Design a protein around this ligand. Structure first.
Ligand SMILES: Nc1ncnc2c1ncn2[C@@H]1O[C@H](COP(=O)(O)OP(=O)(O)OP(=O)(O)O)[C@@H](O)[C@H]1O
Ligand SMILES: Nc1ncnc2c1ncn2[C@@H]1O[C@H](COP(=O)(O)OP(=O)(O)OP(=O)(O)O)[C@@H](O)[C@H]1O
Lengths: 208, 410, 305, 297
C-alpha cells in the first residue's frame, strides 16, 4: 500500500496485482483486499442510503400517524417519557440535520399544561418517537457496529461521521477529543490493518 | 460583486492599439478577421484569473484594466539591458515585477512541480485579493477539446488538457476553466444529492412539526387534497414514497362513515402544500435548467430518473418512446448549448463568461434563443461574447461593441 | 457591422422554420414584443428589424421601407413571414381638410401599414398620454397639471397636426424639434399659440417660412375631424411636442405656488429622454388594450401570425 | 466523373431514416444539428473513398448508395446470431459480406501492412471499379486538426491524423485528404480576399517587400487558402466534401468565396452543410433540407 500511495480497489486492482505478480511470480492471486479509500467511499454511500431510508420512513410514519390520530380523535408519566425520548433524539449525531425536538416538545407541553382525547395523541406521539428512534438504530446498525468495533482499538482518536445543514455532504473521518477532524489517511500502518481487517469481516463488505 | 469596466491596451504585438470599455452584464464583441478579439479574450482571461506569468508570452507595452468598483491594474512590459521584465502595478500602489526568462524557466520546469515564482505570484495575488472573481474561457475549438477529454477533465484538475491546449495554441493560452459536459453531469448528480438531503431534512422537520399543528386544532378541501395526492404520486421527486392517494381515500372514507377535525384537515393541507413548495424550491434551479435545455430538444428530453431499489439516480435523455440515453449521445451543437446554458446557470461558479464564436455547430434557430435562455436565468454574471453571427446578438444591440485596432507604423 | 444582408436574410428565411415579423425600427420591435407577450408570454414569434439589415446601395442603406419592399417582393407568397411599415402621410388627402382614405389597417400579402402616421400615433389616445405623463412626472403638482393637460389635449391635436404638416411642406421634418421651445408656448382656454420668438439660433428665413406654413395650414386642420386629426401627427415630432406642451402647462399652472419649483420641474420634464417617453407610452398603450374601446392595435397582424 | 446521386439511409442507429437526391456539382445542406448532416458527410466520404470497414463501426440496418452513372451500392448490416455482418451488395452482382467481429479483429491487428480483411476491402474496390473519384474530406474542426501536427501530415499521408481523428470522434471518421500548407486563376482568386498583401507569381508579395512563406498567415486566412486550394483543378480528382465552410469566417467573406470556388469550373461535386445563411447567398437552388424521419423502436 506504500507503493500504491506513491503512484486501487477491490474491483479495479490491475496495476497492483500485475506488480505483485511481477515480484512474486505469476501464480499469485489478484489483490482483492479493500483499500481504506474504498471503505471510506462505501461508508459514505451507506450513510447516504440510510438517510434516504430515514426520509422514506419519516414520510410513511407521518401519513400513518396523521390517519391514526384523525380516526381515533373522534398522562403525567407520558410527558416525562416523551421528554426523555426527545432529549435522547436531540443528543444523537444522526440528527445533525434537525435538532429542534425539544422546542416542539415544549410547545406541545405548554399547549397541554394550560388546560381523554389528548391521551391517545400523547401515546401515539410516544410511539412515533419510539418508532423513529428504532428506525434510526436499524438504518445505522451496520455502520455503528463497525465503528464500535474499530473504536475499541484506537486509543487517542475515534472514527465517526458528521452531518451539517449548511453543507450537504456527510463528513466521514477521524475525530479527536479536542474536536479536530482528520481523514483516515493519517492512520499508522497497524491501525490501517485493523481498519481493513475489520471491514472485511463486517456486513458492509461483500460476501466473500 | 467586482466586474470589469474598462480595458486600455497599448501596442499589442507592437502592431495595434485597442481601448474598449465594457459593461457589467453583457459585452457582445463583433469585428473583422484578425482584429484581435481572441487576443483580447486571452488578455482578459489572464488578467481576471491572476495568471500574470502568461504575460511574458505577450508582446505589449502597457495594459490598463479598470473594474467597476475602482480597482485599476497596470501591466507594463519593459526591456532593460536586453532582459525583458513584466511589472504589474495595482491601483493601491502594490506592485510586483518578475523576469520573462524566469517565467520561461518556471514553465520549462513545470513541463520538464511548483516553483518559487509561481508561489510568489500566488502569495502576491493572495495578499492583494486579486483573484476574487474567476473567468470562464470558452474557446472556439472546445467541441474538439471536450471530445478529446471524453475519448481518453475537471475544473480543479485540468493540467493535461491545459498543457495540450498550450502546446497546440501557444503558452499564452490560459487554463481551461470552462466546464465539461461530464463535469455538468457530475455536478447535476451532486446537486440531486444535495436536493435529496435537503428534502430528507425537511421531511424530518415536517414529521416533528406536524404534531404541534395537530395539538393546536369542507368539500373543497377534499378535492384539493385529492389533487395534491395525485400530483405527489405522479411526481419524479416522490419516487421513494408515492402512497398519498390511498391515504386520501382512507381519510375520505373515515370522514364519511361517521371543529378540531377541520383544523386537523386544514393543517394537513397546509403541511402538504408546504412540502410541495419545498420540493419545488429545492429543484427550482435544476427544473429551470432542464426547461431551458428541453426548449431546444425535439425528440428527447434531459431528465433525471430515480429508483426505489437503485439508490443511484439516473441522469440522461428520455425519449417519447420510453428509451433512456446518456448525455454522450447528444450531438456537437446540443453539447455546446448544454455547456453554454450551464455557464449562465446559477449552479455554476461566479466567473466571467468569455466565449469566442458561441455559434459553433449551432442551428440558426438555436442561436436566436440561446441568449434569451441565458439571460432569463438571472445569474448576474458578466458575459463577454465574441461572435460573427448576428443571430447571436439580436435583441441586445445596445451592448454590441466594435473593435477598431489602431495600427502603428514602425 | 455584424448584420445580415438582404440576400443573407432571404437565405435565413429559407433555412428558418420560425414565424417571423419584419418591422422598420428597433422601437417597433420592442413595442410589438410587449404587445405579443401580453396575450402570450410564452409566444415563440421572432420579430426582425429592417434597420439591422445591411444594404450595399447608399440610398437603400438607411431606407428601411425599401429594404422591406425588396425582401417582400423576392419572397412574395410565403406564409411564415409578415412585414410591417409606417404609413407616413400616404393615403391622406390635404384638399383643405384632413381625410383618411383607408381608415383601417393596410394589408397586402403579409405587408402591413400603421393606421396613423407611424406606430407612435397609436399612443395618441388621451388616456394613454394621461397615464404616461402622470406616471413620469416630478410628483409635485401632477394632478392639476394632468387636469389642465386633459383640457388642452382636445384642441392641441390640431396644433400638433398643423406643425407636422408645416414640417412636411418644407420637407424639414426635424425642424420643430430644435426650433420650438416650451417657453414659447402659451396656455390658453384649451388651445395654444406658439408665438414667433424674435431670437433664434437658426436663420430667420427658415423660421419665417415655418411660421408662414403653420399659419397657412392651421385653419384647414381646425375644420377637420378631431379623430382623423390625431393620426397625421409625425411620431418623432409628436413625442417632443407633447413633452414641451406638458412642460409648459405644468409650469403655467404650478408657478403661482412656487415659481422656482415649477421652473425646475418644467426643465426636468423638458430634459427627459425620448426613449423614456416612448417606452412609457408603449407600456400604457399595452395596459389600456381591452379596458377602453378607443385604444387600437394591429389586430390583423397579430391574428395573421 | 463519378459523383454520388442518392444516399438511402434506413434505421440509422434504428431511429432515423433519410433519403437525399444530390445535384451534380453543388449540394448545399441545411438542417438541425443531430439530424445527420456531418453523419451524411462522413457516410459519403467513407463510401466514395471506398472505406467499407467503417460501417462495421456504424449502427445501421441497410444503406443504399446510387451514383450519378446509375451504379448502385447497397450496404446492409444484419445480426446473424450475435455475430453481426456487413453485406455490401452492388448492382453488378459482386457482393462482399464480412463479420463485424472480423472487422474489429482486423482493426486490433492494425493497432497492435494491412491485414486480411483490409486487403479484402482493397480487392473489392479494385475489382469492381468503386473509386474512380476520391473524396477530399474537410472536417469542421480542421483548424485545430492542422494545429495538431503544427507543434509536432500531407494530403496523401494522413493515417496518423485520420487515426487520431477517429480516436477523438469515432472510427467512422474518414481519411483527411484536405490540403495543408488554373494556378494563376487560383492566385487571383485568393487575391480578392487578401487585405495586407497579395499572392501571385514560392513567396508572398507584401507592399513592404516581405517574401513570407505559406504558413505565417492567420487562422481564417489559412482556412480560406485550404478551402480554395482544392477548389482549383490543382487538387486531386476528388468530390470536394467540406463540413461547415463558415468555420472561423466573417459573415461578409462567405459571399464571393463560393463564386471563387465555382470560378475554377472544376466539375467536381461540392457538398456543404452550413448553418450560416451568408454561405449560400444566391445558391438557394442547391440548398437541400435534411429531414430525418423518426421511427418507432
Ligand atoms: N504572435 C502573435 N500571436 C498571435 N496573433 C498574432 C501574433 N502576431 C500577430 N498576430 C495577429 O494578431 C491577430 C490575432 O488573431 P485573432 O485570432 O485574435 O483574430 P480575430 O480578430 O479573433 O479574428 P479571426 O480569427 O477571424 O482572424 C491576427 O491578425 C494575427 O495575425
Ligand atoms: N452510434 C450512435 N448511436 C446513436 N446515436 C448516435 C450514434 N452516433 C451518433 N449518434 C447521434 O446521432 C446524431 C447524428 O447527427 P449529426 O450530429 O451528424 O448531425 P448534424 O446535423 O451534422 O449535427 P452537428 O452540427 O451537431 O454535427 C447525433 O445526435 C449523434 O449524437
Amino acid at each position: 500500500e506504500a507503493w500504491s500511495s506513491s503512484s486501487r480497489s477491490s474491483f479495479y486492482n490491475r496495476k497492483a496485482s500485475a506488480f505483485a505478480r511481477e515480484l512474486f511470480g505469476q501464480f499469485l492471486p489478484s489483490i482483492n483486499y479493500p483499500s481504506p479509500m474504498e471503505i471510506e467511499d462505501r461508508l459514505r454511500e451507506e450513510i447516504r442510503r440510510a438517510q434516504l431510508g430515514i426520509a422514506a420512513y419519516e414520510s410513511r410514519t407521518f401519513s400513518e400517524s396523521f390517519v391514526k390520530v384523525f380516526s381515533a380523535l373522534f398522562t403525567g408519566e407520558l410527558l416525562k417519557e416523551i421528554e426523555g425520548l426527545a432529549i435522547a433524539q436531540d443528543s444523537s449525531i444522526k440528527n445533525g440535520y434537525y435538532a429542534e425536538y425539544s422546542k416542539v416538545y415544549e410547545e406541545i407541553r405548554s399547549l397541554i399544561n394550560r388546560n381523554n382525547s389528548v391521551s391517545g395523541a400523547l401515546v401515539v406521539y410516544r410511539d412515533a418517537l419510539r418508532d423513529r428512534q428504532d428506525y434510526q438504530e436499524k438504518a445505522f446498525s451496520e455502520i455503528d457496529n463497525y465503528m464500535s468495533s474499530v473504536n475499541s482499538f484506537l486509543e487517542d482518536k475515534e472514527m465517526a461521521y458528521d452531518f451539517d445543514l449548511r453543507r450537504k455532504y456527510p463528513k466521514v473521518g477521524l475525530k479527536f477529543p479536542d474536536g479536530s477532524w482528520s481523514p483516515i489517511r493519517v492512520l499508522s500502518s497497524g491501525e490501517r490493518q485493523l481498519l481493513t481487517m475489520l471491514y472485511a469481516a463486517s456486513k458492509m463488505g461483500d460476501d466473500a | 460583486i467586482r466586474t470589469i469596466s474598462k480595458i486600455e491596451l497599448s501596442k499589442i504585438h507592437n502592431r495595434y492599439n485597442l481601448t474598449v470599455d465594457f459593461f457589467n452584464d453583457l459585452n457582445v464583441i463583433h469585428g473583422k478577421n484578425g482584429a484581435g478579439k481572441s487576443t483580447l479574450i486571452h488578455v482578459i482571461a489572464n488578467i481576471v484569473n491572476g495568471d500574470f506569468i502568461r504575460f511574458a508570452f505577450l508582446i505589449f507595452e502597457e495594459i490598463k484594466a479598470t473594474y467597476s468598483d475602482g480597482l485599476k491594474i497596470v501591466i507594463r512590459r519593459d526591456k532593460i539591458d536586453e532582459q525583458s521584465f513584466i511589472s504589474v502595478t495595482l491601483s493601491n500602489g502594490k506592485y510586483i515585477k518578475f523576469a520573462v526568462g524566469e517565467a520561461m524557466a518556471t514553465v520549462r520546469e513545470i513541463e520538464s512541480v511548483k516553483s518559487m515564482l509561481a508561489m510568489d505570484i500566488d502569495k502576491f495575488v493572495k495578499e492583494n485579493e486579486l483573484q476574487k472573481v474567476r473567468a470562464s474561457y470558452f474557446p472556439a475549438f472546445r467541441t474538439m477539446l471536450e471530445a478529446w477529454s471524453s475519448s481518453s477533465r475537471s475544473s480543479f484538475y485540468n493540467r493535461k488538457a491545459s498543457a495540450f491546449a498550450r502546446e497546440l495554441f501557444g503558452q499564452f493560452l490560459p487554463s481551461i476553466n470552462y466546464p465539461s459536459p461530464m463535469e455538468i453531469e457530475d455536478r447535476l448528480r451532486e446537486e440531486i444529492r444535495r436536493a435529496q438531503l435537503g428534502i430528507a431534512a425537511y421531511e424530518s422537520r415536517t414529521f416533528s412539526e406536524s404534531f404541534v399543528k395537530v395539538f393546536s386544532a369542507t368539500g373543497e378541501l377534499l378535492k384539493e387534497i385529492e389533487g395534491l395526492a395525485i400530483a405527489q404520486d405522479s411526481s419524479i421527486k416522490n419516487g421513494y414514497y408515492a402512497e398519498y392517494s390511498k391515504v386520501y381515500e382512507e381519510i375520505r372514507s373515515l370522514i364519511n362513515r361517521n371543529n378540531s377535525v377541520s383544523g386537523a384537515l386544514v393543517v394537513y393541507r397546509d403541511a402538504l402544500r408546504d412540502r410541495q413548495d419545498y420540493q419545488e424550491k429545492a429543484f427550482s434551479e435544476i427544473d429551470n435548467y432542464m426547461s431551458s435545455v428541453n426548449s431546444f430538444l425535439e425528440d428527447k428530453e434531459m431528465a433525471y430518473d430515480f429508483d426505489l431499489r437503485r439508490k443511484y439516480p439516473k441522469v440522461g435523455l428520455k425519449f417519447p418512446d420510453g428509451s433512456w440515453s446518456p448525455i454522450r449521445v447528444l450531438s456537437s451543437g446540443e453539447r455546446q448549448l448544454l455547456t453554454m446554458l450551464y455557464a449562465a446557470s446559477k449552479m455554476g461558479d461566479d466567473a466571467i463568461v468569455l466565449i469566442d464564436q458561441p455559434e459553433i455547430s449551432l442551428h440558426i434557430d438555436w442561436q436566436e434563443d440561446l441568449l434569451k435562455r441565458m439571460l432569463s436565468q438571472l445569474s448576474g454574471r458578466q458575459i463577454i461574447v465574441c461572435t460573427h453571427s448576428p443571430s447571436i446578438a439580436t435583441g441586445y444591440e445596445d451592448f454590441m461593441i466594435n473593435i477598431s485596432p489602431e495600427f502603428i507604423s514602425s | 457591422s455584424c448584420a445580415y444582408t438582404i440576400d443573407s436574410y432571404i437565405t435565413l428565411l429559407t433555412m428558418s422554420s420560425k414565424k417571423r415579423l419584419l418591422v422598420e425600427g428597433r422601437h417597433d420591435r420592442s413595442h410589438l414584443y410587449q404587445l405579443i407577450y401580453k396575450f402570450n408570454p410564452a409566444s415563440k414569434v421572432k420579430i426582425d428589424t429592417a434597420q439591422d439589415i445591411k444594404a450595399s446601395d447608399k440610398a437603400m442603406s438607411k431606407n428601411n421601407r425599401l429594404k422591406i419592399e425588396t425582401i417582400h417582393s423576392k419572397v412574395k407568397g410565403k406564409d411564415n413571414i409578415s412585414f410591417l411599415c409606417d404609413r407616413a402621410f400616404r393615403e391622406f388627402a390635404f384638399n383643405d381638410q384632413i381625410e383618411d382614405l383607408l381608415n383601417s389597417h393596410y394589408c397586402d400579402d403579409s405587408l402591413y401599414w400603421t393606421l396613423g402616421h407611424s406606430l407612435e400615433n397609436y399612443f395618441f389616445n388621451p388616456s394613454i398620454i394621461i397615464d404616461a405623463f402622470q406616471f413620469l412626472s416630478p410628483s409635485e403638482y401632477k394632478y392639476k397639471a394632468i387636469e389642465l393637460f386633459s383640457e388642452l389635449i382636445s384642441s392641441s391635436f390640431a396644433v400638433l397636426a398643423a406643425v407636422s404638416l408645416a414640417a412636411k411642406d418644407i420637407d424639414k421634418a426635424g425642424l420643430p424639434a430644435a426650433l420650438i421651445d416650451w417657453k414659447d408656448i402659451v396656455i390658453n382656454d384649451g388651445t395654444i399659440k406658439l408665438i414667433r420668438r424674435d431670437s433664434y439660433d437658426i436663420d430667420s428665413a427658415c423660421v419665417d417660412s415655418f411660421f408662414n406654413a403653420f399659419d397657412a395650414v392651421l385653419p384647414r386642420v381646425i375644420a377637420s375631424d378631431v379623430g382623423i386629426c390625431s393620426r397625421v401627427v409625425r411620431g418623432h415630432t409628436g413625442i417632443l411636442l407633447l413633452q414641451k406642451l406638458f412642460s409648459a402647462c405644468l409650469y403655467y399652472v404650478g408657478r403661482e405656488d412656487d415659481a422656482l419649483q415649477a421652473d425646475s420641474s418644467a426643465n426636468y420634464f423638458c430634459n427627459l429622454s425620448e426613449l423614456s417617453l416612448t417606452t412609457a407610452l408603449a407600456e400604457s398603450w399595452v395596459r389600456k388594450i381591452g379596458v377602453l374601446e378607443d385604444v387600437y392595435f394591429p389586430d390583423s397582424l397579430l391574428k395573421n401570425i
